[PDB]
């Protein structure tokens, strides 16, 4: 096992980059490329256990609602500015500041008076997070969380430069020259929706473990260009869907699958800006439930590992106190059925005093995206007969805005989990939450998931049961949203490419320990 000359790694996105402020990033992709310039307080190590990172080491309390994070001395930013206590101070206060308008505020409503700033009630400077000094943040949480240290990991909890934030204004996380970096890896080169450079980050105090140079990143919308490109050397790894994966799957030496506790699924939007759509109706949202066969869906046109689900909370994402998988204990989820979704879709039809509808279905740019879209439009216009979708493709940046906006009135996205419990789906769609982007509301569905909360460490087996009936009463009873399948990431890795981890929360990949052999 031999280090090659040239430490650079080659591989494609099929979206530009919605943003590079941690404070605003609400996707995977920022959180990857964050993932790998930036530094929390922790990290997930090689099979994703959280170990110190930004922190050289940490404390508890007897009643785990204080944390003491000790720092490291030699640790700089990218501009040469020591990476202090304070910058996790800044960057925690800026998350849940209002003006701030954070979609992912919520996620740090576990420190302490965090959701009072967030509601406005106290100000920032009374957020639970003190830098008593350079090397020292001492936190303090609402109550005892026993995944925290992995929460610390999470983007959202990653540091921020306030006089370089400051400075930007703006500007900041928009641009390569725009965004500062405590992680491995700068990003530069950051050419919008073409491609961006990581370079190796000669300020980063854990230098000396990383390898790589560099890692280049195209934007590619098409599967057959990303097969090409692979095939020639001219990237390193490839996502494989479709006919594509037939070619690699029996390579031993470079196809691999990623079996991701990931969900995909439609949303319902019951309000396009502030008029009601057609998705109030129950009985429609039923009929779209009922009417897509997922088994073609993921055998013929993703054909990369997917299972095909009609459950929202993955399988192999948590385990109950008594070590049963949530989804194999529940096995939620409405099965689809042509004839069902007739007879619900005629049911339908008079609740809303119309016979024909048009919805606006919203799915992304990308080359399997289309087919997967095409498809589904097929299942819901022969299954709903009257019913007319109209596909609209949309960037990623821009379908996020959509979305966020409740401009759509049915969308095909994907979930991947913040943490290790079926919270991080289940909690999206209480009345009013952040990330509910649909006005879905159930009075019987809030109380069930927040009861579900202060309960994990009292009764964490009554918990279990009452997830499961509040995921059951969304999926089967109120129909919110249709669950299309779990993700299984078919790809090729070149042989001399090693040492890249896949993670099952965000950052999806680090490259830190990744090198090139001959
Ligand atoms: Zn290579």
Do not use: C
């Amino acid at each position: 096992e031999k280090l090659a000359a040239k430490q650079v790694f080659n591989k494609t996105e099929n979206q530009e980059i919605p943003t590079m402020d941690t404070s605003k990033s609400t996707d995977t992709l920022g959180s990857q490329i964050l993932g790998n310039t930036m530094e929390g307080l922790y990290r997930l190590d090689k099979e994703n256990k959280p170990i110190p990172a930004a922190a050289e080491s940490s404390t508890k309390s007897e009643d785990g609602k204080k944390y003491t994070f000790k720092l490291r001395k030699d640790a700089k930013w990218s501009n040469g500015d020591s990476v202090t206590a304070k910058d996790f101070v800044f960057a925690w206060q800026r998350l849940l500041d209002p003006k701030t308008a954070a979609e992912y505020a919520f996620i740090a409503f576990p420190i302490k008076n965090a959701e009072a700033v967030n509601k406005g009630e106290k100000p920032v400077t009374e957020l639970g997070v003190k830098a008593v000094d350079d090397l020292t943040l001492e936190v303090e949480l609402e109550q005892a969380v026993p995944y925290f240290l992995n929460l610390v990991a999470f983007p959202s909890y990653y540091p921020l430069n306030e006089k370089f934030v400051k400075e930007k204004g703006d500007k900041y996380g928009l641009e390569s020259d725009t965004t500062v970096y405590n992680g491995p890896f700068v990003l530069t080169d950051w050419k919008h929706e073409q491609g961006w450079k990581l370079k190796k980050n000669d300020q980063y105090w854990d230098k000396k473990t990383v390898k790589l140079d560099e890692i280049n990143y195209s934007v590619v919308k098409e599967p057959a260009t990303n097969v090409n490109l692979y095939d020639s050397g001219q990237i390193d790894f490839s996502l494989l869907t479709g006919e594509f994966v037939d070619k690699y799957r029996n390579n031993k030496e470079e196809y691999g699958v990623y079996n991701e506790p990931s969900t995909f699924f439609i949303r319902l939007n019951q309000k396009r800006g502030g008029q009601d759509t057609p998705l109030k109706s129950k009985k429609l949202r039923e009929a779209i439930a009922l009417s897509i066969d997922k088994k073609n869906l993921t055998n013929v046109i993703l054909n990369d590992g997917s299972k095909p689900a009609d459950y929202l909370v993955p399988k192999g994402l948590a385990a109950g106190p008594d070590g049963k998988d949530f989804q194999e204990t529940f096995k939620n989820g409405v099965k689809p059925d042509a004839k069902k979704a007739a007879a619900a879709w005629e049911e339908a039809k008079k609740e809303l005093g119309k016979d024909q509808v048009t919805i606006e279905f919203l799915n992304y740019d990308t080359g399997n995206a289309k087919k997967v879209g095409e498809y589904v439009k097929d299942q819901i216009e022969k299954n709903l007969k009257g019913v007319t979708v109209n596909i609209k493709l949309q960037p990623f940046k821009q379908k996020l805005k959509l979305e966020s906006d409740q401009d759509y009135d049915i969308s095909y996205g994907g979930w991947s989990p913040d943490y290790a419990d079926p919270m991080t789906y289940l909690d999206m769609f209480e009345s009013k939450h952040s990330h509910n982007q649909m006005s879905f509301s159930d009075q019987k569905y809030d109380e069930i998931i927040k009861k579900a909360g202060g309960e994990l460490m009292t009764d964490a087996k009554k918990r279990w049961e009452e997830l499961g009936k509040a995921e059951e009463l969304l999926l089967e009873e109120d129909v919110a949203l249709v669950p299309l399948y779990q993700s299984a990431r078919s790809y090729v890795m070149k042989p001399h490419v090693k040492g890249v981890v896949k993670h099952n929360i965000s950052p999806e990949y680090s490259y830190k320990w990744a090198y090139v052999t001959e």
